[PDB]
Amino acid sequence: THNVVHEANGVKLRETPKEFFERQPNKGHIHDVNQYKQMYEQSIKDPQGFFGPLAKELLSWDHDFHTVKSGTLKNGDAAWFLGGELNASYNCVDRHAFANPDKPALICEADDEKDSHILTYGDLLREVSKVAGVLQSWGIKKGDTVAVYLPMNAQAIIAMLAIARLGAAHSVIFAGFSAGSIKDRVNDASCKALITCDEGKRGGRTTNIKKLCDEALVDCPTVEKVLVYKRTNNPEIHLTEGRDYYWDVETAKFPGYLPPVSVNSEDPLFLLYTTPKGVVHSTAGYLLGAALSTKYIFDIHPEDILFTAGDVGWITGHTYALYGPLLLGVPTIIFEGTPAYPDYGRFWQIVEKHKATHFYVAPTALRLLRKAGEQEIAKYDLSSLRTLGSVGEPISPDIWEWYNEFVGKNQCHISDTYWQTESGSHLIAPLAGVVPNKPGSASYPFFGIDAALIDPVTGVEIEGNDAEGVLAIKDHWPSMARTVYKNHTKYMDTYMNPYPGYYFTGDGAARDHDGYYWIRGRV
Amino acid sequence: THNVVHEANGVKLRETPKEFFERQPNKGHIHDVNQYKQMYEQSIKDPQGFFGPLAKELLSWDHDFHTVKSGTLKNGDAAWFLGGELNASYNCVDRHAFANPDKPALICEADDEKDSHILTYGDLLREVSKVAGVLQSWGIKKGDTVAVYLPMNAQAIIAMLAIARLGAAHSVIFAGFSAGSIKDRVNDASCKALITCDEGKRGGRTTNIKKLCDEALVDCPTVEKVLVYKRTNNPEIHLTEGRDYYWDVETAKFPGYLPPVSVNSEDPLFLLYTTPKGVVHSTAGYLLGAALSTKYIFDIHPEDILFTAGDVGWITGHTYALYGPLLLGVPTIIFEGTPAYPDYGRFWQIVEKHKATHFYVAPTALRLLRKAGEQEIAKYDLSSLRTLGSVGEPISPDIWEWYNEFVGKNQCHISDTYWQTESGSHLIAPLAGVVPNKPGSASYPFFGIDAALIDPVTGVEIEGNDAEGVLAIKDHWPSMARTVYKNHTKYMDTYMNPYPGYYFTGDGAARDHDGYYWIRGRVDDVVNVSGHRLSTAEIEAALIEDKKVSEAAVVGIHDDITGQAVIAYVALGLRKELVLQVRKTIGPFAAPKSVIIVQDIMRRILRKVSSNLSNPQSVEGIISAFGA
Amino acid sequence: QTHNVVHEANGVKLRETPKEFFERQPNKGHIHDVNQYKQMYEQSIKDPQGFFGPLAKELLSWDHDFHTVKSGTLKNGDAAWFLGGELNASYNCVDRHAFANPDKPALICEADDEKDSHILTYGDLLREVSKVAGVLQSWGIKKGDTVAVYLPMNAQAIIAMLAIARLGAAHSVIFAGFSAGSIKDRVNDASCKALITCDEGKRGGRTTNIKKLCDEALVDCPTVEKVLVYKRTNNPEIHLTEGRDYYWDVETAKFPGYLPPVSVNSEDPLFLLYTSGSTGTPKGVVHSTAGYLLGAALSTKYIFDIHPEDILFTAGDVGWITGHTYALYGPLLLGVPTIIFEGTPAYPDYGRFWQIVEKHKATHFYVAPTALRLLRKAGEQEIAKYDLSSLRTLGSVGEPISPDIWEWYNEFVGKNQCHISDTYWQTESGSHLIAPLAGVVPNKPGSASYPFFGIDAALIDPVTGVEIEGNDAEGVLAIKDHWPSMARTVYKNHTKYMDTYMNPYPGYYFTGDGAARDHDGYYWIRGRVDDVVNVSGHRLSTAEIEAALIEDKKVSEAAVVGIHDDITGQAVIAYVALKEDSEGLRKELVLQVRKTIGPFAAPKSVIIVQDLPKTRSGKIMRRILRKVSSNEADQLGDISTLSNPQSVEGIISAFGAQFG
Ligand SMILES: Nc1ncnc2c1ncn2[C@@H]1O[C@H](COP(=O)(O)O)[C@@H](O)[C@H]1O
Ligand SMILES: Nc1ncnc2c1ncn2[C@@H]1O[C@H](COP(=O)(O)O)[C@@H](O)[C@H]1O
Ligand SMILES: Nc1ncnc2c1ncn2[C@@H]1O[C@H](COP(=O)(O)O)[C@@H](O)[C@H]1O
Ligand SMILES: [Cl-]
Ligand SMILES: [Cl-]
Ligand SMILES: [Cl-]
């Protein structure tokens, strides 16, 4: 029994169902919860000997690295795989296109299913090369930043991979932002180019996209050129001559292959803004964390198919709609529309349509379907799923049991992934087919994450279980953000200085007698 | 006997003379024709196992490659030696300078022999490094393009190698071109710099070089600086302060070594313009093709000396005057003048002077020397020669016999080489000392070249020998051109789309019972509309048969649905009467998509108009008419 | 054996390295004995590929391997080493040591006032270099650019140099004693895109103006886009130009403490160091990356006998090549601590050098004979106050060391227990050329002894231009083949490079020095042959000083020459003719030279004459001014070949009257 953790008193360990293993294509990646702690204890006491080999296994290098880990949280100088060189789009596209060009890559589901398509890895290589050819033709090169203002569709996945192909950092801007929020993000990074579309389709209603760009671009002198996709092909849309150009028109000029550009492990892969602050992520570190978590926390295999019902304007689409799954050579499902269009059975038609084996979504949608589309679940077949995931905020133990039976049929594993934009990948989450669940908890911290609670009053680490306090990590990890663009002081003041030697997550949590962490919300 | 390939009837096979092997420095690279077929068959079925090792033998790499071959013709994404890095100037200069800096590299014969000279590989490394140093200090870098407007002399070779040393792509503009032809090519490539000379010398006559550049440059805003070599040192030649700088003045400021810049295998090495279309060639694949063909088709050894009587303004000078021979580390003769100056024995005086072992020339020049200078050949010792090459057009059996008797004394091997600017290197040619000749035939296709004859109407491959049709290639090869600069769609529409799954040479050919290919003339207008091959020339004739039409012009343009579409412009309801005329005389599917009637052939203008001898005022009415 | 030519060597007892040297040596020496050295030297000459290849792979960390050890020839000016190789200078001097031992001292910084002293570990140095490199990167600095440095000899100068080299750019360090005109010359010749400087300096307790001289020069340096200013004094009265000048502490705060180093080619330029020549224009000497670094590591390791446990105190300034190679690159490459002294040997008193050695138990001390002369004159009494027993190697740099100063150095600083390394070299050699290896080569006081690895030294007859075979000889000192750390060019002026070093004696490198070789093969430097004047270790251009004096509108013509000086080694004497209080104007002209070049270029004396001796062509005959400034007027010989032989009498009278 727990005197402190009131959430822990009387909670049955929900061992992973037996049908989860009937549906695995191959022997699971970690046998039992006992091997997970042998691999975890090594990843904390011996990061060099744990992440080194994994980096060599999961990523393809253009130059080997000479030092696995360097720096400290106190000094904000973390670095991983120093001296190595790779390319993000080579690991996400090329190396799978060479292996099996016809394997699906981007299973795109448009607003209207009448506008849906699928890109094989061989097609994704030809389209990324042509868009990278355009950007290279325009003078975009390693060290530049390129803004993206696109809905959740193929064009966004291609623009990011194309920008990363040249060694430039893509700064994705959620399609729903205003001209002001566009102006602020473009000017902070001094983007030299922007990729966008004429207008989108969000649940039947068409959205003004180019209009908001033009309104914002009038205060963005750094933007030399804009690439515009024809999502609707509406001719009343204005393109300023000499600045704006058409996706289809430019890409038609360049070949289906462009060489990737090697970047250093610690070269910025992208900027993502949360005044807004631009979180910066390294290349090697972020990519490894994205691939590891997707392989272990979701139990992804070459045959699997991931449907992250998120958006690339946020970190969830970055890591688990794009980089995570494509690094592993599995197809990912890119959903442009809403969970209510045409009706509340769209998520479920798609899972049935493509036999998706993993589903990843935030609770905020589970409360929308629990309070509207609870009947549409039985229409469609959801027998392909092994793993179901929660991302956004905490997951009610109510919605947990709802998410488990209605969508999972009491046959799936459920992983409640805790993590922020600054972490890059999952921090605390239960591994599919390994970690038994406690409804409402994130469970054990992931490889390389040395979680710890700190008494906010004294600022000392709270040893022993059955306790609460501020959540903090005692060392940095590969996918940790390395700075805030052009403002490292705010980066230190926010994460590294409140508790020297620790990384301040900004949340409060509790650890029960079993070690399971309970996320008690922001402080 | 042959019912189709009449050229081949009663043609005695011509074995390589005994003197060829007496003059050969070492054992030949291929023992006999049976070893050649074994090697060729592997180059087709297993290009990875064949070209992989050769790329590691013949080229020096800064970064290893992980995949030999990628892409398909149908997708226009061919690539070779992916992930690899190298430098063209290192493989053509540095590595040979280190091994033997005193070995001759450029044997330069000037317009007047008084000005001839010889650069060793050591000399070439210093002179290339110094020019590259100037370009580098000017801001030229990987990704840029630099134009070259120079005669066929040492400075042209140095300029090309210095540009490639920085990872930039050179674009060589033949020195005979006008100011307008210069204007078009510089602007299409947006060259940041130009390398040229004040004036040229050709046949004793002074040519204006800088004068035409100044004339062109007024409309080339991308050119930031020009390097000017004092070829004549004429003091009346004006240099624009702030833009033009002297070759000798700037090179004096920089050292004789500059580190080469590594580039990717598929980074552009150069643009070569032919509306002129800028043919783009890769780095690794092109260089491997240049070395392989020069080695095996001409039988080049380190002891040899190559004289390619061509100009770097064309692909022949690119591949077989520069990259080919310098990659293999042998000396190459760079001839600045003409075959008639000071007299009609100059070619042969040069061979004798430098004891050249290999001679490579176009049939056009052989015809001129046969007509006006046959008496001069016997005056010179040409016994150093072993291989006689022919380039640019099929060689008549008569010209073949003349070439064989009067130049080779019936003692040399003759290699009629078929290829084109877009192939980078030889496609069909008799390997020196290996393949016996049939006069007028190019014989067998080369390594990596899977040649086929396809029916021009159906696009289906013709099986069996004693056949004729369109010459097409079933898979890309290392030195195949990769795109047209900033215009990959024209590249696809010209080479890959007309006959999908094949490369379209634009030539017709025939294959005899021994598998020897006989290049025929060019094929005609092939416009492919939903699988129907249409003739724009054939449609114009039909429209003109209508007594209401004075003149008619038909062209082809890209179409997202049907592949291509034919648009007919007509100079004099009526549009319906003309479309039926074409259906009856040609065929039902030959009707133009559209028939536009205008008030007033330079079709280069109609293609750009419909896509969206001079009389420029009509252009406005045609643009208005197409909309109407 | 007696010498008919090398008189310096007659009756000179050979001086073995004392026994106590090896007692204080931490490990087995890097070279077994002098016979192993001869074998290794012979291979470095006959087989440089087999010798320098392995050493380059031991001492440097490479991002890409090299395929050819050595290329090019002196005659063609195309020397190159380790071709195809890639590396980074800041990685080899910082990163690789920080990963191994982040807490090991790297920069032992002794400020002008010891109250301000501090110590940076290799870990600290990595963060501060990364932050400065981060600022430069955000400003647009990239491989191929040049960045000027105008800083005193403190930690920030070292960080600026390493941060510039981290990006693949080349730093150009401008000695802090230079005026705005000398800053102007160097920044414009190199077209520096940025400048790193400080608000004010501290030297001898007195505040020096640094930023003020930059603003004065920068008004004519249109290539400089941004300036980084360190708050050395934090004086708030120092103006920063909005849009151009930015504070070191403010900008570095914006960037993280790690930045990836940029790989550069072995032959990409590492730095420019502007040097005075026979013209009035400084020539920017350019050094490669790989070859220069290998030379710094090789010489520092084998000539000084540096081990990981050791601590090096090079009493030099990064404004000159001595600080470049043996205060920064040499010791940091080997991963040992180096003492960076910002002050003077006289402040607070004439024992400061020894307080520093004792404080930090320095094992290696490297100093100029000019300072040894000063301490013998004014501070000998201070030595007995300090424990100097940590020292074992005592070096001398920049000028000839008198046999007397050698003995003083040996007895009073080394207690007759240390090895002395008289090191001969020059800015253009990058590293040592001729020097006694510590613990290996016995000394002849005043001789540089044997040439170092890769240095094939020769003496050339000045009359015939042919190499002199056999020993007991003298002539022009020349080197028969290039070496790894040899300078590669003069910036954007390779013709001056060829005309100065390679063309005078084709097939050879021309040091500009004369020398003699005794029967034991020891070399004895006889000084410059090319009328280059060395004042307190500072290479000066008499032509540049003449130009400064003429800028005064009262001067018609001026001639400057060099003469021996008991204090500074040599002194420049200026003869001035006016167009027309003398001692007054003499002060106004000396100040004129201070304004245009720097305070350390000021003439010792200014003699005012009516006419300068001239040829019939009209050129000034400085050969006569030199013999007069010395008491060798009786060696002038026939002067009827002058166009004004009567001026000679007035020159002898003027020098006698005004010198003093
Ligand atoms: N599984 C979870 N349980 C509770 N809170 C979560 C979970 N996942 C994410 N969060 C919250 O979401 C925040 C992430 O913010 P951001 O990713 O920056 O939009 C975290 O700081 C947590 O407060
Ligand atoms: N041996 C040959 N026989 C027939 N045509 C040739 C031959 N060599 C080159 N060509 C033609 O020359 C053109 C290529 O130009 P070039 O490569 O400069 O000779 C193409 O139209 C080829 O068909
Ligand atoms: N050990 C030494 N003995 C005599 N002269 C030296 C010695 N070291 C340096 N020098 C002189 O200092 C010059 C170096 O010039 P710099 O290093 O540019 O000031 C040499 O050319 C010599 O004239
Ligand atoms: Cl090799
Ligand atoms: Cl080895
Ligand atoms: Cl000089």
Can you describe what's shown?
- Chain A: One of its GO terms (molecular function) is ATP binding.
- Chain A: ATP binds at residues 392-394, 416-421, 507, 522.
- Chain A: It comes from Candida albicans (strain SC5314 / ATCC MYA-2876).
- Three copies of one chain form a homotrimer.
- Chain A has one domain (6-506): 3-Layer(aba) Sandwich (Rossmann fold).
- Chain A is globular, with a radius of gyration of 22 Å.
- Chain A contains 15 helices and 25 strands.
- Chain A has 523 residues and is of the alpha/beta class.
- In chain A, helix 4 crosses helix 6 (154-165) and helix 7 crosses helix 8 (210-217).
- The relative contact order of chain A is 0.14.
- In chain A, strand 24 (503-511) and strand 25 form a beta hairpin.
- Chains in contact: A-B, A-C, B-C.
- Chain B binds chain C through residues 62, 94, 97-98, 122, 125-126, 129, 136-137, 252-259, and chain C through 64, 68, 71-72, 76-80, 83-84, 144, 265-268, 488-489, 492-495, 497.
- One adenosine monophosphate binds at residues 314-316, 391-394, 416-421, 442, 507, 519 of chain B.
